[PDB]
Amino acid sequence: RWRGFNLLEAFSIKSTGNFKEEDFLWMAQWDFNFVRIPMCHLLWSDRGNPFIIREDFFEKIDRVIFWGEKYGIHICISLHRAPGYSVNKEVEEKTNLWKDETAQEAFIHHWSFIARRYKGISSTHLSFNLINEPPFPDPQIMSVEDHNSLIKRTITEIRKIDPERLIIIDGLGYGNIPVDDLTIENTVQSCRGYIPFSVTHYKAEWVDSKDFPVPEWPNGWHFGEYWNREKLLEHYLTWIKLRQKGIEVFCGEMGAYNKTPHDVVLKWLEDLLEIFKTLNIGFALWNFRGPFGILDSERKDVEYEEWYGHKLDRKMLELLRKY
Ligand SMILES: OC[C@H]1NC[C@H](O)[C@@H](O)[C@@H]1O
Numbered sequence: 001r002w003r004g005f006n007l008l009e010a011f012s013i014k015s016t017g018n019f020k021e022e023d024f025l026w027m028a029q030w031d032f033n034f035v036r037i038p039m040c041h042l043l044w045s046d047r048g049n050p051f052i053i054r055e056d057f058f059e060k061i062d063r064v065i066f067w068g069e070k071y072g073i074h075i076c077i078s079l080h081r082a083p084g085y086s087v088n089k090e091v092e093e094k095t096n097l098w099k100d101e102t103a104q105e106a107f108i109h110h111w112s113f114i115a116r117r118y119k120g121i122s123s124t125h126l127s128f129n130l131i132n133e134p135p136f137p138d139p140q141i142m143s144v145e146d147h148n149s150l151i152k153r154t155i156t157e158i159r160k161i162d163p164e165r166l167i168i169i170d171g172l173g174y175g176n177i178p179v180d181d182l183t184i185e186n187t188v189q190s191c192r193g194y195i196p197f198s199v200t201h202y203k204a205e206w207v208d209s210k211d212f213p214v215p216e217w218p219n220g221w222h223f224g225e226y227w228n229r230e231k232l233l234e235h236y237l238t239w240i241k242l243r244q245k246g247i248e249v250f251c252g253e254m255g256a257y258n259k260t261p262h263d264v265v266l267k268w269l270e271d272l273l274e275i276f277k278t279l280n281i282g283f284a285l286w287n288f289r290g291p292f293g294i295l296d297s298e299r300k301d302v303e304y305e306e307w308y309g310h311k312l313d314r315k316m317l318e319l320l321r322k323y
């Protein structure tokens with residue numbers, strides 16, 4: 001079962017691409033075994049021409065794969081921005097990956113490049129997460145069939161190059177809805193652990209959060225609905241139903257932002273992790289270092305432990321380690 005973090009050094013158009021080896025050392029010493037790498041294709045491509053690939057960028061990803069091997073940490077490479085789609089609003093995509101043949105051609109071009117580069121790296125060490133958080137399947141933007149046909153033909157092209165490559169598929173509705181008609185060999189579907197937004201995204205600048213209620217748990221609030229541990233259990237039970245079709249599931253992003261009081265964060269995260277352990281669902285916290293992380297999270301109500309120049313939320317870490 002995968003347990004770990006997302007690392008963001010290739011996440012943004014302003015990112016350096018230089019991941020920190022000590023992140024891998026420390027999470028290995030804390031007995032974690034998984035990292036997801038959400039990548040912004042513009043770091044090696046172009047806004048106007050989605051077929052540009054600057055191969056030199058991937059020397060940085062080569063290092064991540066080496067460190068994954070060195071420290072026993074599986075690497076999941078993800079396209080967080082691809083031609084025609086990203087949830088990140090720092091750049092507006094002028095095309096629509098879900099409908100536009102040219103964007104889909106470029107999408108496959110990029111994944112074919114990546115598949116070819118790492119064909120020699122086994123799926124024990126490396127998986128591909130094709131696209132981060134597709135939206136709800138409003139067919140005027142992305143139908144269920146739009147999504148499934150694109151994923152299917154992308155997997156086909158990847159596996160002509162590397163037949164054994166493990167593929168991770170995000171749920172629809174921003175990683176929250178299982179995908180019914182994708183029963184493809186050697187795939188995993190990825191859900192999310194941000195429910196409820198009143199706890200996890202309180203005062204978040206990048207969503208419309210101004211009318212969220214004061215955080216509390218239980219009885220947190222999520223797009224009009226109130227949530228508790230039993231409701232979380234029901235939700236993730238619908239996810240592990242995919243195992244009856246030979247599909248594994250895991251939670252590719254989870255956590256709470258750094259303006260939520262710590263007592264609420266810990267009560268909510270404990271409940272989520274109790275459910276994930278109950279149902280044997282793996283997880284990745286959205287940050288290692290950062291606002292959603294166990295390190296350098298800039299919370300005002302935490303007694304941070306020294307961690308080699310960083311600030312460690314020990315209670316959050318130990319919750320993760322025990323589940
Ligand atoms: O995919 C990463 C993305 N997931 C959705 C979260 O709200 C956001 O904070 C994060 O940047």
